Structures are given as structure tokens and as C-alpha cells.
Amino acid sequence: MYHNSSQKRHWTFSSEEQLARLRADANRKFRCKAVAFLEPHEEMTLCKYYEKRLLEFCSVFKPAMPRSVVGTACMYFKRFYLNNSVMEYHPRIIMLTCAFLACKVDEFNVSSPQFVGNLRESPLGQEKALEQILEYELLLIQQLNFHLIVHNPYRPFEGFLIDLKTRYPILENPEILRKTADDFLNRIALTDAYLLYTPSQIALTAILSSASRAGITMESYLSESLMLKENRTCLSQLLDIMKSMRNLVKKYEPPRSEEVAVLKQKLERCHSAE
Amino acid sequence: KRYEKLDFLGEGQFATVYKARDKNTNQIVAIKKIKLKDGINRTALREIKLLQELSHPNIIGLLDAFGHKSNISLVFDFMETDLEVIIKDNSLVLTPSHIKAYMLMTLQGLEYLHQHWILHRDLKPNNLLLDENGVLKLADFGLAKSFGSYTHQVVTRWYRAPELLFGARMYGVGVDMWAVGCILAELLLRVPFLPGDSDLDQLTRIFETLGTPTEEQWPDMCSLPDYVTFKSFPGIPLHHIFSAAGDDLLDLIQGLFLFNPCARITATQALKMKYFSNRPGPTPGCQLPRP
Amino acid sequence: ALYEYQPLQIETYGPHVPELEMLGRLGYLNHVRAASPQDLAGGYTSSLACHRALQDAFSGLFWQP
Ligand SMILES: CC1(C)CC[C@H](Nc2ncc(C(F)(F)F)c(-c3c[nH]c4c(P(C)(C)=O)c(C#N)ccc34)n2)CN1
Numbered sequence: 001m002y003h004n005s006s007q008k009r010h011w012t013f014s015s016e017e018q019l020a021r022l023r024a025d026a027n028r029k030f031r032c033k034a035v036a037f038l039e040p041h042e043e044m045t046l047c048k049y050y051e052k053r054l055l056e057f058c059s060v061f062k063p064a065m066p067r068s069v070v071g072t073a074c075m076y077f078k079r080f081y082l083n084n085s086v087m088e089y090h091p092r093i094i095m096l097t098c099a100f101l102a103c104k105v106d107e108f109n110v111s112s113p114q115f116v117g118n119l120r121e122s123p124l125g126q127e128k129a130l131e132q133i134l135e136y137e138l139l140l141i142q143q144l145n146f147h148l149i150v151h152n153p154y155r156p157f158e159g160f161l162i163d164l165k166t167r168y169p170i171l172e173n174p175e176i177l178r179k180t181a182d183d184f185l186n187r188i189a190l191t192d193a194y195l196l197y198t199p200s201q202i203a204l205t206a207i208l209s210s211a212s213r214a215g216i217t218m219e220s221y222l223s224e225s226l227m228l229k230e231n232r233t234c235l236s237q238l239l240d241i242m243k244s245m246r247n248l249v250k251k252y253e254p255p256r257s258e259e260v261a262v263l264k265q266k267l268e269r270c271h272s273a274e
Numbered sequence: 275k276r277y278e279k280l281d282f283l284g285e286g287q288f289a290t291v292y293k294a295r296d297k298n299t300n301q302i303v304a305i306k307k308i309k310l311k312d313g314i315n316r317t318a319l320r321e322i323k324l325l326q327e328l329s330h331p332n333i334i335g336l337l338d339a340f341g342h343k344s345n346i347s348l349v350f351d352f353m354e355t356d357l358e359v360i361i362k363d364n365s366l367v368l369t370p371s372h373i374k375a376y377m378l379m380t381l382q383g384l385e386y387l388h389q390h391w392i393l394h395r396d397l398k399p400n401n402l403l404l405d406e407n408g409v410l411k412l413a414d415f416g417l418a419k420s421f422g423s424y425t426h427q428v429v430t431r432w433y434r435a436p437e438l439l440f441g442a443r444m445y446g447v448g449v450d451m452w453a454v455g456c457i458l459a460e461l462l463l464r465v466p467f468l469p470g471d472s473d474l475d476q477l478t479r480i481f482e483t484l485g486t487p488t489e490e491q492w493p494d495m496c497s498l499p500d501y502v503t504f505k506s507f508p509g510i511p512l513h514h515i516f517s518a519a520g521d522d523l524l525d526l527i528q529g530l531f532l533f534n535p536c537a538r539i540t541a542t543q544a545l546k547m548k549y550f551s552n553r554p555g556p557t558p559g560c561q562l563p564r565p
Numbered sequence: 566a567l568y569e570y571q572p573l574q575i576e577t578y579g580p581h582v583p584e585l586e587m588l589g590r591l592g593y594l595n596h597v598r599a600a601s602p603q604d605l606a607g608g609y610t611s612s613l614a615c616h617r618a619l620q621d622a623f624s625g626l627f628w629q630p
Contacts, residue, residue, distance in 0.1 A: 001327075001389075001390050001391070001575075001577075001620065001621075001624055002621065002624040002625045003575065003576065003577045003578055003579065003624040003625045003628070004327075004329065004390075004575060005327055006326050006327060008625060008628065012630050013630060014630045015630075100313060101319075104313070104314070104316055104319050105319055105323050107419070107420075109316070111312070112311050112312050112313060113311070130311060133313065134311065134313050134343065134344050135343065137313045137314055137344065138314060138341050138342065138343065138344075138346065141314070141322075141339070146322055146326055146336070146339050147326060148319065148322055148323040148326065149323050149324075149326065149327050151621075155617070155618060155621040155622075156621045156622045156624070157622070158618040158621070158622070159617075159618035159619040159620065159621050159622025159623065160622045161596075162593055162596045162597060162615060162618050162619055162622070163593075163619060163622055165595075165596040166591065166592050166593045166595070166596055196630075198624075198625035198626065198628055199621070199624075199625065200579060200621070200622055200623060200624055200625050200626040201625070201626060201628075203622065204622075204626060225580075226580045226626070227580060227581070234627050237627065237629060238626070238627065241629065374568075378568060385573065386573060389573060389575070391617055391620075421609075421613065422613040422614055422616065422617035423614070423617075437606060437607050437608060440606075442603070442606065442607030442608070443603070443607065444600070444603070444604045444607045444608075444609035445607040445608050445609055446607075446608050446609050446610070446613055447608075448608035449608070492606065493602075493605065493606065494602035494603070494605045494606040495606050496606075497601075497602035497603045497605075497606050498603060498606050498607065499603065534608070535606075535607065535608025536605065536608050536610060538608065542570075542572075545570050546570045550568045550570070551567060551568055551569060551570070552567075553567070555566030555567055555568070556566075556568050558566070
């Protein structure tokens with residue numbers, strides 16, 4: 001359960017300034033080891049690009065890979081690159097090891113051979129990639145700190161829809177929100193938000209974003225159904241948390257194609273030396 | 275690593291277990307060294323993913339994990355004994371208070387575990403480890419699985435509930451509850467309650483000892499995919515089986531061996547039963563028998 | 566030295582979750598899939614699914630890092 005999870009305890013950070021710090025640290029700490037070079041924003045542009053790559057992998061995986069695997073994989077890739085440089089471990093490889101570990105942890109039983117049967121290469125590439133995946137699987141797990149269960153927003157999302165259908169006939173059919181709240185969960189997933197707020201807050205912000213995008217103000221759900229008339233500071237703490245997420249999806253810009261091409265060439269080069 | 279390997283504690287299907295010491299603390303640990311192009315074994319990832327999310331006195335704590343390549347070593351606290359060894363110790367008396375204490379901890383661990391939407395799916399007396407302070411921990415989370423979202427093969431046969439034996443895919447806490455029922459029966463009888471050699475013979479001994487179910491008892495029994503009609507047995511009255519058991523314990527045992535796994539008492543319902551609150555105190559962990 | 570059932574008082578940092586047995590009464594089970602007969606005979610109910618979905622929605626909703 002989230003409220004006593006290793007996710008809450010260790011992987012929901014106090015702000016983006018704490019995120020930027022762990023990343024900017026690890027870039028510096030790479031350089032300190034490498035001298036015994038991408039700048040942090042360029043590692044970030046690449047991690048954005050390879051989290052996209054992880055999403056494309058997970059979306060075409062030939063046994064239909066569940067959203068809770070895909071979300072767990074994407075979370076492993078966000079957590080990995082908080083504390084590790086893309087210049088030590090190539091994000092291409094680590095993305096596969098993310099999907100691999102996530103398949104196993106989420107109990108989506110798929111054998112190694114048909115795991116790498118999904119990779120868009122030759123069979124020599126598939127064997128070599130499998131071997132690299134198995135090389136990094138314990139590394140990944142050590143860097144995830146053995147915090148393997150990821151609380152995705154999708155089950156919270158189901159619960160809010162059940163709760164709304166039951167208790168909030170003001171929103172006559174809550175299921176009309178599903179598409180645009182899913183689209184907003186997908187946008188929240190590209191941001192830092194998974195590292196910053198709870199799965200329920202993300203789920204509810206996505207619901208209330210879709211609510212607001214339909215012009216259906218659900219303020220009475222928060223105040224009346226969720227009982228935050230009783231504690232209006234908890235109502236505003238909630239509203240502040242949700243405001244800040246909508247600002248994260250607002251401030252997020254995709255990594256540019258032409259930009260990523262330079263950073264990729266740099267990345268390849270950082271990997272071919274040393 | 276930072277571990278000295280002291281003693282081979284045993285080996286089974288997925289791992290070898292060693293009593294080991296970290297070169298870092300006085301505390302002895304149990305390292306479970308997991309054996310083999312699959313990557314890290316799923317039964318190790320099962321214990322890692324679950325025991326990192328569970329913090330309860332009656333669930334085994336994962337201390338550490340380490341390894342190299344596709345091999346891994348899960349580090350746990352060392353538990354001096356287990357319930358199987360207590361049950362099998364012919365010169366150790368299971369007072370009702372001991373039985374209540376073991377049951378209570380088992381149910382507290384299970385209540386927590388089921389609250390966290392996990393089934394152990396392998397309760398049996400040897401998976402009920404006792405620390406030397408007599409806290410029973412559920413352990414061997416290698417088959418444990420989240421529920422409220424499975425497979426019939428789970429639970430070692432003598433503890434395997436009849437809905438598992440009839441091929442139930444989906445189930446909930448009742449598979450653990452029947453296993454608690456079986457472990458309770460064996461705390462009482464000091465031997466396997468239903469020691470059946472096959473899925474057929476486990477269903478036979480179930481229906482022999484407890485009576486064949488009906489659709490009055492188990493509403494949709496017949497819809498279980500490996501269902502076949504047994505001959506009507508009368509069952510043996512639970513006071514003829516458990517003639518030391520008081521009516522409160524028989525009411526417990528009755529609810530623990532209810533054929534309907536829905537009707538079968540949950541760990542919460544079981545803990546709220548009058549059995550646990552009655553006059554023999556569930557023994558303090560300090561005073562449970564060390565075998 | 567008697568026992569008394571005290572529930573687990575795990576803080577969820579979220580709304581009140583409606584108790585499992587009340588879900589049918591309160592009308593939440595109108596909004597989850599009915600467990601089929603094989604589900605039921607295995608001991609799996611629509612209430613388990615519902616309860617876990619609601620538990621997860623509410624868990625950590627009010628929690629600030
Ligand atoms: C003989 C006793 C009663 C006294 C030593 C032992 N102490 C202990 N302390 C912690 C753990 C834990 F839980 F921490 F690992 C384990 C353990 C758990 N699974 C085991 C197995 P398997 C292979 C059945 O998984 C085997 C086998 N054979 C052997 C040991 C364990 N054992 C328990 N048995």
C-alpha cells in the first residue's frame with residue numbers, strides 16, 4: 001500500500017530543487033570518477049528521450065504488457081537517472097533492464113527469449129542486448145535500492161472513478177473523464193511528478209484536470225465527499241499540490257529531435273572512450 | 275560481501291539457505307542464495323519486492339540483497355526455529371495457550387499481510403519461523419502474491435484448501451485461512467491433519483474427515499474447473515477429531531475449515547473470535563517452547 | 566494477559582475508506598465487476614476488487630513530502 005511504501009518513504013522528493021540536486025550531483029560525481037561530457041540539462045534531455053524510448057518499447061511488447069509494468073518500468077528509469085549518469089550507464093540499455101525487471105516484479109511472466117524478441121534488431125543484437133540486460137539487472141536493482149514495488153496512479157484512478165460513480169452524482173457519469181484524465185496521467189508521466197507527488201494526488205489531479213477541461217468543477221467532491229470542509233487547510237494543501245502538477249505538465253517541453261541528435265553523438269562518444 | 279557463511283541451514287527448490295554473520299554487526303542473518311538466461315530468479319524478486327513493502331513484527335524482514343550478474347543473495351534475520359519443528363517435537367507439549375499464541379501471531383502477520391493485499395500462498399508449519407524472542411514470522415514469501423486484482427498449484431498439499439484442489443484460479447485470504455486451519459489442526463493433532471498424496475487423495479481426506487460439501491455449504495463449488503463429485507461422507511465431528519478443543523476453538527476451527535472460502539473466517543474475523551479473547555492468555559513470545 | 570482485537574491503526578493520509586461489508590450496502594459494488602461463480606467458489610468477491618481500488622485512491626492523497 002502507498003501510505004507505508006518505500007516509494008513514499010524514499011522516492012517522493014520534497015521538490016524539484018531536490019531532484020535537480022541529486023542529478024547535478026551524479027553528473028559531477030561521474031566527472032570526478034572519470035577524471036580520476038554532457039551538462040546536467042543534457043543528461044535530462046536524454047533521460048526524457050529514453051523515457052519516451054521505454055514507453056515505445058513497453059507499448060509494442062508482443063505479449064500485451066500491463067500499464068502497471070509500463071509504469072513500473074518508467075519509474076525505474078526515472079529513479080535510476082536521479083543518482084546515475086547517462087554517461088556511466090547507457091540509457092538505451094538501462095531502459096530494457098527497466099522493462100525486464102518490471103515484467104518480473106509486476107508478475108508479468110514472459111521468458112527472457114520472448115522479452116528480447118521484442119527488440120527491433122537482428123538475433124545477434126537480441127542476444128547481445130539480452131546479455132547486457134542480464135549484466136545490468138542487479139545494478140538496476142541496487143540503484144533502485146531494492147525498492148521494486150511502484151505505486152502507479154492507475155489503481156488510484158480506478159478507485160476515484162468508483163468513488164465518484166457511487167458518491168458524486170453531481171458528475172453524472174464519471175467515466176466520461178477517463179480518456180482526458182488518462183491523457184493527463186500520460187502527460188504527468190513525462191514530468192518529474194512521479195518523483196514529487198503521490199499516486200492518488202496524480203490520479204486526482206488528472207481527474208480534476210479532465211473535470212476542469214470539461215468545465216465540470218468538482219470542488220464539492222473535495223470539500224464535501226473527501227470531507228475537506230472539516231479541514232480547509234488540507235483542502236488548500238490538496239489544491240496547492242494539484243496546482244503545482246498542472247504547472248509541471250505546463251512547464252514540460254519535449255526534448256527536441258535536432259538537439260537529442262547532438263547529445264546522442266556526445267553520449268556515444270562518452271561511452272566509446274574510457 | 276560483508277558476510278561470513280557459518281552453517282548450511284538447508285536447500286530447497288529455489289535457494290540454498292545459510293546461517294551467516296555480517297562483518298558489521300553481532301546479529302546473525304540467514305542468507306538465501308538463489309540458484310539459476312532468465313536473469314535474477316523470480317522467487318528472489320518476489321521476496322525482495324514484497325518484504326521491502328511490509329513492515330510488521332510477524333513478517334520476516336529482508337535486511338539486504340547482493341549478488342553478481344544473474345545470481346542474488348537475499349539476507350534476512352536468522353530465525354532459530356519454526357512451527358514444523360515445534361509440531362514435530364514429540365517431547366514438547368502444546369498447551370492451548372501456546373497454540374493460541376502461535377495462531378495469534380500467524381493471524382496478526384496474516385491480517386497485516388492481507389491488509390496489504392498479499393496472500394502468503396505457502397503457509398505450512400516450516401514457513402512459520404520463530405525468532406529466539408518467540409515472535410513467529412511469516413517467511414518464505416517466494417510464492418506470496420498480491421490479491422484483489424493466480425494458480426491452483428500453490429500451498430504444499432496437506433495445507434492446500436479444497437478450492438485450490440478443485441482448481442481455483444482466483445481466491446483470497448481463505449487459502450491462507452485453510453492453511454492456518456491445517457496448521458492449527460496439526461498444533462492439536464501433532465501430525466498432518468490431511469496427509470494426502472495427490473490432489474485426488476487430499477480432496478478424499480478432506481471430505482472423509484470434514485464431510486463432503488454441498489451447494490448449501492459451498493454455493494458455486496461445482497463451477498470450480500477441476501471439480502468432480504466425491505461420494506457423500508458424513509465427516510468426523512470436530513469434537514471427535516479435536517477432543518481437547520474447547521467449543522471456542524471448535525468454533526474457530528469450524529470457521530477456519532468452512533468449505534465456502536467466503537464464509538471461512540478472515541484473519542481479522544478470526545482474531546475477533548472469542549477463542550483469542552478467552553481466559554487462557556496467548557503465551558508471551560518469551561515463554562513459547564524453543565524446540 | 567488476555568488478547569483483545571485492536572485494529573491496525575496504519576495512517577493512510579487519505580479520505581475514509583468505506584468498510585468491505587458496507588460496499589454493497591453503500592452501493593460501491595454497482596460500479597465494479599461481479600465476481601463470477603468460479604471466482605465466488607474460489608472465495609474471490611467483487612468487494613475485494615472494489616475495496617482495494619478505493620483504498621488505493623485514498624491512500625496518501627493528503628500527504629506532503
Ligand atoms: C531447522 C530450523 C527450524 C532452524 C534453522 C532455520 N532458520 C532460518 N532462519 C531464517 C530463514 C529465512 F527465512 F530468513 F530465510 C530460514 C529459512 C527460510 N527458508 C528456509 C529453507 P527453504 C529452502 C524451505 O526456503 C530451508 C531449507 N531447506 C532452510 C532454512 C530456511 N531459516 C529454520 N529451520
